[PDB]
Design a protein around this ligand. Structure first.
Ligand SMILES: *[C@@H]1O[C@H](CO)[C@@H](O[C@@H]2O[C@H](CO)[C@@H](O)[C@H](O)[C@H]2NC(C)=O)[C@H](O)[C@H]1NC(C)=O
Ligand SMILES: *[C@@H]1O[C@H](CO)[C@@H](O[C@@H]2O[C@H](CO)[C@@H](O)[C@H](O)[C@H]2NC(C)=O)[C@H](O)[C@H]1NC(C)=O
Ligand SMILES: *[C@@H]1O[C@H](CO)[C@@H](O[C@@H]2O[C@H](CO)[C@@H](O)[C@H](O)[C@H]2NC(C)=O)[C@H](O)[C@H]1NC(C)=O
Ligand SMILES: *[C@@H]1O[C@H](CO)[C@@H](O)[C@H](O)[C@H]1NC(C)=O
Ligand SMILES: *[C@@H]1O[C@H](CO)[C@@H](O)[C@H](O)[C@H]1NC(C)=O
Ligand SMILES: *[C@@H]1O[C@H](CO)[C@@H](O)[C@H](O)[C@H]1NC(C)=O
Ligand SMILES: *[C@@H]1O[C@H](CO)[C@@H](O)[C@H](O)[C@H]1NC(C)=O
Ligand SMILES: *[C@@H]1O[C@H](CO)[C@@H](O)[C@H](O)[C@H]1NC(C)=O
Ligand SMILES: *[C@@H]1O[C@H](CO)[C@@H](O)[C@H](O)[C@H]1NC(C)=O
Ligand SMILES: *[C@@H]1O[C@H](CO)[C@@H](O)[C@H](O)[C@H]1NC(C)=O
Lengths: 513, 48
């Protein structure tokens, strides 16, 4: 196995007090895909200044992410005391095709101490620590997140210039405040700047040794290290897993200023990762020496399609999440960032299922429910649709009435009533796009505004919020063609809008640029 | 193995780290991104 070095020496662990309510903050950072935030550059290829579609794992454009903040522990006077940290060790998550993170984005600005926030200390970048693996379970005290068998460990040591990776078995310890003890609270790791990080001798084993004090390393099968140099600039990092093993990505090695990720390293492990957590960490520094740290963020990858704008220097500079909006769908269909003005069809709202209705004599109370769009089963016949009470058509006791295209038309219930079936209905959608002002509006077709609402329970695509930027303040407007959003009743007469809606309707642009 | 590292050239068969095809090479300017090694167009033809 790997030569891990010496075992832990002290038996007792420094106590970990959970102060998690101090860490509740709301500093969201949604992905800006027009800036190419979070984009993993494609593997093995590069391109010219041409725009191409691409498919791969990416963050959603609308995701605000998850936020975590490292902070100094308790100290008083001129000396260190006990840790006062966040409860992040209990935040077990299901792994889901990797994740990406944002690090140091609040650099060269100020924030607060958090644990004693009134001091208002300036903030600086700090690197994250992580643990990954195939299984989790209870600590002997019932605490969440104990990993089993072998797990990944990623930790910086001391100052951010050294990074280590491990695939190893963790071992519980019988010391006071440690995992086999009944005095255990929660796992944490720490750095002590009062003796660590000398400028002529940075302590390369600093965080690993504090890690060893809570878990003895055993049976380690892999270890790696990497070299980093200090730089307060914002950075991107992330993890994916394939049948070739885990991949590590960073923007630092290749594209430090543009922020595009590149495949920095790979790992030999072939075990599937099923769970993910963040290791909490804290600074042991003296009370007058405290320093606030920049916020850390996490976003989750999904197998999304995107337009990618490539620079002549091959950097991705802009991108569009195709499924984010109906307008984004339009751009992807024309493979461009500048669609010509017009009225364009976009995908329709579907239906929205309703709770099931079942009849099969031979469970309650679903015998009938008229009715909207409730899934159904009738003596092994199934489908989704709306039922209505109707007349009586021949022939009775054949039970299922059908049309010439073999669509079910209606049904004889065992309550003696004929009901008819219309399947379900949908709302067609189109958008009005004015390229000159870069503005838009929408049309719901013949649906009528009695079925239209500010939010949707159908549905089609994840948001329509760009319309809502003006339409949070207005009711839907009925027109002879149909219900529309953000149209306004100006009652103007004009010869040609270059955006006719059909009929005598006309969609004037707001006054020209 | 030698001496076939470069030959400019008209339409010589080639192999580049397991990528292969036939074509002419020319000493032109550089382009982004560096260290992705293979430059391609929108139809996935190798460009450079
Ligand atoms: C790279 O794309 C740019 C456009 O983004 C192209 O630049 C155009 O070049 C023509 C020259 O015939 C000009 O008339 C246009 O005004 C330019 N567009 C601009 C400046 O936006 C350029 O040809 C492309 N180069 C390659 C190698 O594909
Ligand atoms: C990574 O950075 C370290 C410096 O932190 C380099 O390792 C040291 O290089 C000096 C050169 O004189 C030696 O005196 C030290 O003994 C080295 N330390 C160790 C632990 O070997 C190292 O070269 C850099 N690169 C890599 C790939 O590790
Ligand atoms: C905080 O300080 C960093 C220092 O790393 C500054 O980053 C500069 O970012 C610009 C962006 O174009 C680069 O051109 C400079 O080279 C960077 N300075 C360096 C590397 O010393 C930046 O002024 C501050 N803010 C952020 C967010 O990084
Ligand atoms: C840790 O704190 C978070 C705060 O959002 C909470 O949701 C979570 O349940 C906590 N973990 C526990 C109580 O195990
Ligand atoms: C931890 O123990 C509880 C019982 O207190 C159990 O319900 C839970 O499933 C256990 N955790 C895991 C990951 O199985
Ligand atoms: C470790 O992996 C084995 C492999 O099957 C699994 O059965 C077991 O639940 C895991 N955990 C422990 C504590 O052995
Ligand atoms: C691996 O870990 C087991 C614990 O289950 C330990 O007993 C064994 O000595 C280790 N073996 C080697 C060869 O690393
Ligand atoms: C519709 O069903 C009602 C009971 O809900 C019944 O009284 C009525 O006769 C039915 N209408 C017909 C058969 O036209
Ligand atoms: C719009 O303006 C005209 C002006 O006469 C008015 O008659 C009409 O009721 C208004 N509203 C709608 C929904 O068309
Ligand atoms: C062409 O190649 C020569 C060497 O064969 C080199 O010196 C020169 O810089 C190249 N021309 C470029 C890169 O434009």
């Amino acid at each position: 196995y790997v030569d891990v070095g010496p075992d832990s020496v002290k038996s007792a662990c420094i106590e970990v007090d959970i102060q998690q309510t101090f860490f509740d903050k709301t500093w969201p950072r949604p992905i800006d895909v027009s800036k190419a935030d979070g984009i993993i550059y494609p593997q093995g290829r590069t391109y010219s200044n041409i725009t191409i579609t691409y498919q791969g794992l990416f963050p959603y454009q609308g995701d605000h992410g998850d936020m975590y903040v490292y902070s100094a522990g308790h100290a008083t006077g001129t000396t260190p005391q006990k840790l006062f940290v966040a409860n992040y060790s209990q935040d077990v998550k299901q792994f889901a095709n990797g994740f990406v993170v944002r690090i140091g984005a609040a650099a060269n600005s100020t924030g607060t101490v958090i644990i004693s926030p009134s001091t208002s200390a300036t903030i600086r970048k700090i690197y994250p620590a992580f643990m990954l693996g195939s299984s989790v379970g209870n600590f002997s005290d019932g605490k969440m997140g104990r990993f089993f068998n072998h797990t990944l460990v990623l930790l910086p040591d001391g100052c951010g210039t050294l990074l280590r990776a491990f695939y190893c078995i963790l071992e519980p310890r019988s010391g006071n405040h440690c995992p086999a003890g009944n005095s255990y609270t929660s796992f944490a790791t720490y750095h002590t700047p009062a003796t660590d990080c000398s400028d002529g001798n940075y302590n390369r084993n600093a965080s690993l040794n504090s890690f060893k004090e809570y878990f003895n390393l055993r049976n380690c099968t892999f270890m790696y290290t990497y070299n980093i140099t200090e730089d307060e600039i914002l950075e991107w990092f992330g993890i994916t897993q394939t049948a070739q093993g885990v991949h590590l990505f960073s923007s630092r090695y290749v594209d430090l200023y543009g922020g595009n990720m590149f495949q920095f390293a790979t790992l030999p492990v072939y075990d599937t990762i099923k769970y993910y957590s963040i290791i909490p960490h804290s600074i042991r520094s003296i009370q007058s020496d405290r320093k606030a740290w920049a916020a850390f963020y996490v976003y989750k990858l999904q197998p999304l399609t995107f337009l990618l704008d490539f620079s002549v220097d091959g950097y991705i500079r802009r991108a569009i999440d195709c499924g984010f909006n109906d307008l984004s769908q339009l751009h992807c269909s024309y493979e461009s960032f500048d669609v010509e003005s017009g009225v364009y069809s976009v995908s329709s709202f579907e239906a929205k299922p309703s709770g099931s209705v079942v009849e099969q004599a031979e469970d309650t109370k679903i015998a009938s429910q008229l009715g909207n769009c409730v899934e159904y089963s009738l003596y092994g016949v199934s489908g989704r649709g709306v039922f209505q009470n109707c007349t009586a058509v021949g022939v009775r006791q054949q039970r299922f009435v059908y049309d010439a295209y073999q669509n079910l038309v209606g049904y004889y219930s065992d309550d003696g009533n004929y009901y008819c079936l219309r399947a379900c209905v949908s709302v067609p959608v189109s958008v009005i796009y004015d390229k000159e002002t870069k503005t838009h509006a929408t049309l719901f077709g013949s649906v009528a505004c009695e079925h239209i609402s500010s939010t949707m329970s159908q549905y089609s695509r994840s948001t329509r919020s760009m319309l809502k930027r003006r339409d949070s303040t207005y009711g839907p407007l009925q027109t002879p063609v149909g219900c529309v959003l953000g149209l306004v009743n100006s009652s103007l007469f004009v010869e040609d809008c270059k955006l006719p809606l059909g009929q005598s309707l006309c969609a004037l642009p707001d006054t020209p640029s």
